[PDB]
């Protein structure tokens, strides 16, 4: 069957890895390209780049990043972060990106999911959904978790599948930056609302959190800091999960 995935998230601004890494072995460990190349070598299965440049030059900055990463990367990668319309999505794919992540612009216009998918396929569309518990209900926030859209997460995932989204990136706002584990209750809540693949995101602290999140129904586990600062070895992790029944991709050496 299809492999459960481990995915490295690379937060970028101005063509560089926002809060850097700690990988002594590269020269310029803030070069998203060389860090991406590296993550492929130890066995990360996919990369997502999320950019937080300034709105005026954000678009040219991302297009420069995608081009530079496409000439050198031998695995699938996604770009995202302030992608606000079809044009500002078509250009990043044709520039070389394998998938686009859309978030607030998908809440404020479900139509863009179908519009993107219509000329690139659902496979090119990642909808990033950012959720938080509000009065005992999971709700969709936008503007980097600043605005309660008032939309029940449970509704929003059936809409995006409906609109033609290919993959959901599910970030529990409650647990980003916490290193205490993935929001497995939120993963389990979302799992039977959809047959779309779910990337769990937010809260990775140690290997067992990955096992936990896969028992919860995730298809892919996203993480950044734990990898960038060498708290978790990708191969150790994969061998750990292979040991406890998770079907990860683990080649021999």
């Amino acid at each position: 069957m299809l492999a459960k995935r481990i995915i490295a998230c690379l937060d970028v601004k101005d063509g560089r890895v926002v809060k850097g890494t700690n990988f002594e072995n590269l020269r310029d460990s803030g070069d998203p390209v060389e860090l991406g190349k590296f993550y492929s070598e130890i066995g990360i299965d996919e990369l997502v780049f999320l950019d937080i440049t300034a709105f005026v030059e954000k678009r040219k900055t991302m297009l420069e990043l995608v081009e530079k990463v496409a000439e050198q990367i031998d695995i699938p990668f996604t770009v995202g972060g302030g992608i606000h319309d079809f044009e500002t999505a078509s250009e990043l794919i044709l520039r070389g990106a394998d998938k686009v992540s859309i978030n607030t612009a998908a809440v404020e216009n479900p139509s863009l999911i179908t519009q993107i998918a219509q000329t690139f396929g659902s496979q090119a569309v990642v909808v990033a959904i950012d959720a938080k518990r509000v009065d005992g209900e999971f709700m969709v926030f936008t503007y980097s978790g600043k605005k309660n859209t008032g939309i029940l997460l449970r509704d929003w995932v059936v809409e995006v599948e409906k609109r033609g989204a290919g993959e959901i990136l599910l970030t529990s706002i409650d647990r980003d930056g916490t290193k205490s584990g993935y929001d497995t209750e939120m993963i389990r809540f979302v799992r039977p609302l959809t047959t779309l693949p779910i990337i769990a995101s937010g809260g990775a602290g140690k290997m067992e959190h990955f096992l936990e999140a896969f028992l919860a129904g995730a298809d892919a586990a996203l993480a950044a800091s734990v990898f960038h600062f060498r708290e978790i070895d990708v191969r150790e992790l994969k061998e750990y999960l292979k040991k406890h029944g998770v079907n990860v991709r683990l080649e021999g050496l």
């Binding site: 069957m1 299809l2 492999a3 995935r5 492929s40 070598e41 066995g43 299965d45 496409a70 000439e71 050198q72 031998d74 695995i75 699938p76 044709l94 070389g96 394998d98 396929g121 659902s122 496979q123 290919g166 047959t195 693949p197 991709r249 080649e251």
Partner: protein, 200 residues
């Protein structure tokens, strides 16, 4: 050795162009050319990339005069390799575009997969009959080859359904996955394709 890659067909092909470029870094007699038009001739290894509608691509080899230039590569006992849509070409027809005759270099046609979760996307295991390395490669495709258990080279299973991810009819290879999106093993796959092509 000179390797040529049809640079015309739909979808992104420069990802294959590197990665084949990357794979021949270990060879001396090797050179890689983007093939735009039938003029240049001839290559030892010819790649047919592409992703998209079967009709398009059949339409693009076609106006760019490459059906005949491919017809002559297979004949003159040269390695012709179709990857992704390039593999789905090569055959008679697709239900993705009824009518268009394809390349018809291998006997068979093309059907949609029988899974309610499409496209087939992600890392899947590929078992080769011989020669090329076994393990997980990366897939994005909604259509599937139909050929006789003779042109089958590698098999993969998605959502219950077994199907050929690689084909081989003598010196024509086809691969449904993206070897250029498969990290270490994908370079090994492409390196072994190149190693097969020095033996003529």
């Amino acid at each position: 050795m000179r390797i040529g890659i049809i640079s015309v067909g739909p979808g992104n092909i420069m990802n294959l162009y590197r990665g084949v470029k990357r794979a021949s870094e270990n060879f001396e007699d090797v050179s890689i050319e983007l093939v735009e038009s039938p003029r240049n001739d001839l290559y030892d290894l010819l790649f047919i990339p592409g992703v998209g509608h079967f009709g398009e691509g059949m339409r693009r080899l076609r106006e760019n005069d490459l059906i005949d230039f491919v017809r002559k590569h297979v004949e003159d006992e040269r390695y012709v390799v179709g990857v992704c849509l390039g593999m789905q070409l090569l055959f008679e027809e697709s239900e993705e575009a009824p009518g268009v005759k394809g390349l018809s270099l291998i006997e068979g046609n093309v059907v949609k997969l029988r899974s309610r979760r499409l496209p087939h996307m992600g890392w899947n295991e590929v078992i080769f009959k011989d020669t090329f390395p076994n393990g997980y490669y990366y897939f994005v495709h909604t259509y599937r080859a139909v050929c006789e258990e003779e042109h089958v080279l590698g098999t993969t299973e998605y959502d219950g359904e077994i199907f050929p991810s690689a084909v081989r009819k003598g010196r024509i290879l086809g691969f449904q996955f993206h070897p250029e999106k498969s990290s270490k093993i994908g370079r090994k796959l492409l390196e072994k394709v190149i190693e097969c092509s020095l033996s003529r």
